[PDB]
Design a binder for this molecule. Structure first.
Ligand SMILES: C=C1C[C@@]23C=CC(=O)[C@@](C)(CCC(=O)Nc4c(O)ccc(C(=O)O)c4O)[C@@H]2C[C@@H]1CC3
Ligand SMILES: C=C1C[C@@]23C=CC(=O)[C@@](C)(CCC(=O)Nc4c(O)ccc(C(=O)O)c4O)[C@@H]2C[C@@H]1CC3
Lengths: 412, 412
């Protein structure tokens, strides 16, 4: 009894732009959105750069009063969520509002808000904690606020699976629709971790590039001189719709979401298995889910974080799943341009996977100057590659050995 | 091909006990776990009491070296998870590990760790932030660390739906099993929010009881003089198992999980609608999901937080859904005794709803001295009521207007 799920709406904030067609222009032109951070003093930090959303005006979306109650990550997820709903042309009615849900997640949630309230608490005591500190900081408040704003009475939840969050949110929402629990879902992720604790936390884990002299060159997935990931901010939301609901209202359809894989590695808290066994199981489950032979995959949007162990583990995973086909598909990391939006990474990379299908073009991996040992696949170095893409795959893995794979197909 | 799902294992840390049987004895005896908070100086705070886990020894489960790097919510989540898996008698093998997953959630996760690291950041500087801060504090690391310790390679994720988290984590895991994505899932939630930001934050929102003179009488759901909820910490975990998988290995089955409802209110960020329309919609979805006549419901474990608005919304929902049968069923709030474990509230209350079925007894609502206007149902005031229970329901509501209902049935 499994219903087909298609994408009818997309919304985005990224370091490359304030919407989807600005971010995508940047992806195809191979631009970086990485720069020295301007909103705080990082003198004592070992990393001083990352991907900020530049020029965000929350009052295009909310009243000043509404915005003052919400952490930036929630502001960001609402912006991308409202763009996606507008993009879909969906009309919410008394007849359909219990068939429309939301699954917007985040990896690290209201860390920035918690920092600012912590400063007030330490400087002047608990009477200075904002009344809205709790509702304004918790990860489900993108789902909560969106559903209250639009009157959505379908499944209302949030995933938090670290750097896998966006991929899991989109996949579980697909499941909701395929198994008849909803007809429409808004899904994706938002992240704003560019605070003392985020740069300091990930930096204490020795997980960040320290290439402070050349921020636009720091993120270089599968390059021999990679030294960790680049911390970035933003959001991605997709409108997922049962196929016949989309066709019934004359919705423009971007792609079909055919396959979803999850699988734990059970390996280590913060490092992947070098052999890519985790990504491997997950991609295979996603392909089984889609009813697709590995040889039908044309494009992979890699997780490709620019860490030493992560990048090579992903090459191994792909070689295992795809055998000889590995040298026929294209794989790239848009994190080379966007940096790592953590729990939003899978959301914005789903969108880029969908636009690779719409536009028949593999986005580049910029800064891929000297591919490392074993990195001999078509990694689309430096420049966008026009090619045939009928099937795009998007991979995410996260802390705690969490893995997510989405399979999208062109459809005409 | 929707498969049936049973409970084969349960685990818990609560203000009444360091396991299920100790906690349940507390519940049936009408014992309060609420006491003045010992682990900090709260003289500047308007709320100075709550439910602590008392005498918790993480070394009954994990080495000192590991435990030291984990926030209390992760220690609580792992303890409950390990209890539930031992209680199930399940053996993890190469033949099944890919069919066993985990969904242990939290409302806000690593708040104590975040506060302590903020202190380090503001007094000392970023070089004093723990390298284990991110993996030891983020919400998906109960799922992550449990997969790593036991070798679980099934679906690995975490929900964060505020005070609804433990109910949704259980329900969605059951959906995973129902649709073939897993045969076994460890599901529930864990919370430790008893720090400056938690008491200060919920206090600033004016959500907390301020009955400092009488802590054990502060939590009084449906009582006229209720003045906000009581903040508690802990964890609940269930082993969910496909029925033929349970039968095949001859497992002890506690109950069947026959229904799961979700719904957004789409009303307000921190307040329910007075009529409880979201709770009503959620319970109706759950009962329809279970294929039951509403007159089959014998026992409701209410969300019942002791907030002025929440308690009366939930009587209105129960009147709307069950009509005259609202006067035949028993409804109680175990939060009268445990207080509010937030993201874990739905986990520990699921376990109490299953034990109500095993032991044919409705837990009491303690402190119900003066039922408020319209609170004219059997709310099991003061003392446990032995009675027939074939079907038990557990309700959860959260900030963001998130709702979830679980329906359990004696297995035969
Ligand atoms: C235990 C070790 C060894 C160490 C050495 C090599 C490395 O590459 C890093 C820096 C990062 C590993 C990794 O890719 N994790 C890792 C992962 O498993 C899953 C997701 C991500 C992500 O960024 O989304 C990620 O980053 C690790 C982390 C920590 C200290 C240095
Ligand atoms: C907007 C208002 C009005 C106000 C007036 C009387 C009240 O009863 C409270 C205190 C609590 C509302 C409520 O139960 N929320 C509420 C909710 O929707 C969902 C879950 C819970 C829970 O604890 O699990 C919860 O607590 C509200 C909260 C805030 C300030 C005072």
């Amino acid at each position: 009894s499994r219903r087909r799920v298609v994408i009818t709406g997309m919304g985005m904030l990224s370091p490359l732009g304030l919407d989807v067609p600005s971010s995508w222009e940047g992806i195809l032109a191979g631009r970086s959105g990485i720069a020295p951070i301007e909103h705080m003093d990082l003198s004592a930090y070992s990393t001083r750069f990352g991907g900020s959303v530049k020029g965000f005006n929350v009052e295009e979306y909310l009243s000043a009063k509404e915005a003052r109650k919400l952490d930036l990550f929630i502001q960001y997820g609402l912006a991308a969520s409202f763009q996606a709903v507008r993009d879909s042309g969906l009309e919410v009615t008394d007849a359909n509002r219990e068939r429309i849900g939301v699954s917007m997640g985040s990896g690290i949630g209201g860390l920035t808000n918690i920092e600012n309230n912590c400063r007030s608490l330490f400087e002047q005591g608990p009477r200075r904690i904002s009344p809205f500190f709790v509702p304004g900081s918790i990860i489900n408040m993108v789902s909560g606020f969106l559903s209250i704003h639009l009157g959505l009475q379908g499944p209302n939840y949030a995933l938090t699976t670290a750097q896998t969050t966006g991929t899991h949110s989109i996949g579980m929402a697909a499941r909701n629709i395929a198994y008849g629990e909803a007809d429409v879902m808004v899904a994706g992720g938002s992240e704003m971790a560019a605070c003392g604790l985020g740069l300091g936390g990930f930096g204490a884990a020795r997980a960040l590039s320290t290439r402070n002299d050349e921020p636009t060159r720091a993120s270089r997935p599968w390059d021999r001189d990679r030294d960790g990931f680049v911390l970035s901010d933003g959001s991605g939301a997709l409108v997922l719709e049962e196929l016949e609901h989309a066709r019934a209202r004359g919705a423009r359809i971007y792609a079909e979401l055919v396959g979803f894989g999850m699988s734990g590695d059970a390996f280590h808290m913060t490092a992947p298995p070098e052999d890519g066994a985790g990504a491997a199981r997950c991609m295979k489950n996603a392909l089984r889910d889609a009813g697709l032979d590995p040889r039908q995959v044309d494009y992979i949007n890699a997780h490709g974080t620019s860490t030493p162990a992560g990048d090579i583990a992903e090459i191994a995973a792909v070689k295992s799943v795809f055998g000889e086909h590995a040298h026929a598909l294209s794989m790239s990391s848009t994190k080379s341009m966007t940096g790592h939006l953590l729990g939003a990474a899978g959301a914005v990379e789903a969108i880029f996977s969908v636009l690779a299908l719409r536009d028949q073009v593999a986005p580049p991996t910029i800064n891929l100057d000297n591919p490392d040992e074993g990195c001999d696949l078509d990694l689309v170095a430096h420049e966008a590659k026009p090619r045939k893409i009928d099937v795009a795959l998007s991979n995410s893995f996260g802390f705690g050995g969490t893995n997510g794979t989405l399979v999208f197909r062109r459809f005409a």
